[PDB]
């Protein structure tokens, strides 16, 4: 049972940016405590899995939008905005995209993979626009997800192998052409550490924007840990923001490295407070902050963990109180 009378989390940040959460379509019923926590605390929603490539086009031409639409319907019913996650990734993407259809033992050509990418992107964006029109809550999409490797080079996924380095620019071109009203993001993890990957993201976006690629923002996943350095996060935000793009914190959670003790929860509260003070200070750049999961019991991180503001019993944790 949730605490109904404590402050609605997103309301605390009304003068800064929307506060969202990634959800599962099976946790949206009015009688479900997870759905109650969702509607109470967040004014933005993201599909944790239902809008990924495999979740939308499992086999070629066979589009499965029911779960995604259930989430969109819920966002509309609760006056929430949404982020679309994600049009291209190297995980949760079906193998058929990369296979020659006449000989599945061989790879698709650059032109065929690009055509499939264009058809996927266009169908996905046209689906939400035609079904929901002006009521479409989605304000932007993670057009590409995790395209850098941890050394800062382009990740050598099948997209890169088959097409080459311009597959990123093409994804953005296709998305922009399908729906120019959507803000287009490049999303990634570890770019908040002010290391080689942060520099590579800055370099890549600088390059693509100078070439006219329609990138509107950079999504910083923010899968931080109890040991993360706030100074590095501030420096990363400032560096990426210098490109003149929006910054969104897209998948925030805190890895406790196995320590879920009361002492650790207090340390987590101090760190989350510092993190949100930083986000508020950078409000001129940050346009959304989204948590990757509603409560600890439904977090994607393996156990034991305590990554979010609501615990495994759906109760507000010390970090929630520290922030509000």
Ligand X SMILES: O[C@@H]1[C@@H](O)[C@H](O[C@@H]2CO[C@@H](O[C@@H]3CO[C@H](O)[C@H](O)[C@H]3O)[C@H](O)[C@H]2O)OC[C@H]1O
Which residues are near ligand X by CB under 6 A? Answer: 48-49, 145, 221, 251, 292, 300
Return the number of the residue (108 or 247) whose C-beta is nearest ligand X: 247
Return the number of the residue (50 or 108) whose C-beta is nearest ligand X: 50
Closest approach, Cβ 90 to ligand X, in A, equals 11
Closest approach, Cβ 48 to ligand X, in A, equals 5
Closest approach, Cβ 158 to ligand X, in A, equals 17
Return the number of the residue (287 or 318) whose C-beta is nearest ligand X: 287
Closest approach, Cβ 145 to ligand X, in A, equals 5
Rounded to an integer, what distance in angstroms lies between the CA atom of residue 64 and that of residue 40? 29
Which residue is at the shortest CB distance from ligand X? 300
Rounded to an integer, what distance in angstroms lies between the CA atom of residue 136 and that of residue 256? 36
Return the number of the residue (108 or 256) whose C-beta is nearest ligand X: 256
Return the number of the residue (293 or 318) whose C-beta is nearest ligand X: 293
Rounded to an integer, what distance in angstroms lies between the CA atom of residue 195 and that of residue 182? 30
Return the number of the residue (86 or 287) whose C-beta is nearest ligand X: 86
Measured in whole angstroms, how far is the alpha carbon of residue 303 from the centre of its chain?
Answer: 22
The answer to whether 45 and 71 have CB atoms below 8 angstroms apart is: yes
**Half-sphere exposure (Cβ direction) of 2: Cα atoms closer than 13 Å:** 22
For residue 215, the SS3 value is: coil
Closest approach, Cβ 302 to ligand X, in A, equals 11
Name every residue whose Cβ is closer than 8 Å to that of residue 107 and which is 6 or more positions away in sequence. 98, 99, 100, 158, 161, 162
The answer to whether 184 and 213 have CB atoms below 8 angstroms apart is: no
Q: Which of 249, 143, 244, 154 is nearest to 197 (CA)?
A: 154
What would you measure as the largest C-alpha separation in the chain, in angstroms?
60
> Which tokens sit at 145?
């997800």
Closest approach, Cβ 95 to ligand X, in A, equals 14
Return the number of the residue (213 or 249) whose C-beta is nearest ligand X: 249
- Enumerate the H helices of 242-317 as residue ranges: 262-281
Closest approach, Cβ 49 to ligand X, in A, equals 5
């Amino acid at each position: 049972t949730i605490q109904n009378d404590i402050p609605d989390l997103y309301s605390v940040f009304k003068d800064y940016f929307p506060i969202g959460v990634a959800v599962d379509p099976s946790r949206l019923n009015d009688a479900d405590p997870h759905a109650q926590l969702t509607a109470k605390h967040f004014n933005m929603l993201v599909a944790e899995n239902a809008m990924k490539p495999e979740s939308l086009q499992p086999t070629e031409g066979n589009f499965t939008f029911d779960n995604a639409d259930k989430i969109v319907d819920y966002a509309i019913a609760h006056n929430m905005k949404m982020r679309g996650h994600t049009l291209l990734w190297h995980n949760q993407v079906p193998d058929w995209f990369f296979q020659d259809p006449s000989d599945p033992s061989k790879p698709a050509s650059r032109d065929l993979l690009l055509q499939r990418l264009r058809t996927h992107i266009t169908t996905v964006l046209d689906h939400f626009k035609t079904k929901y029109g002006s009521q479409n809550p989605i304000i932007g999409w993670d057009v590409v997800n995790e395209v850098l490797d941890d050394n800062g080079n382009l990740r050598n996924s099948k997209w890169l192998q088959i097409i080459g380095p311009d597959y990123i620019e093409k994804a953005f071109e296709y998305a922009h052409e399908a729906d120019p009203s959507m803000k287009l993001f490049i999303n990634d993890y570890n770019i908040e550490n002010n290391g080689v990957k942060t520099q590579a993201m800055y370099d890549l976006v600088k390059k693509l924007k100078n070439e006219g690629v329609p990138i509107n923002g950079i999504g910083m996943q923010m899968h931080i840990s109890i040991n993360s350095n706030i100074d590095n996060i501030k420096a990363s935000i400032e560096k990426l923001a210098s490109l003149g793009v929006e910054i969104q914190v897209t998948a925030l959670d805190m890895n406790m490295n196995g320590d879920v003790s009361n002492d650790a929860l207090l340390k987590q509260a101090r760190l989350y407070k510092q993190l949100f003070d930083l986000f508020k200070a950078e409000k001129q750049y940050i346009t959304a902050v989204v948590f990757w999961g509603v409560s600890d019991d439904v977090s994607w991180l393996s156990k034991p963990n305590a990554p979010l503001l609501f615990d495994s019993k759906l109760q507000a944790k010390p970090a929630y109180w520290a922030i509000v």
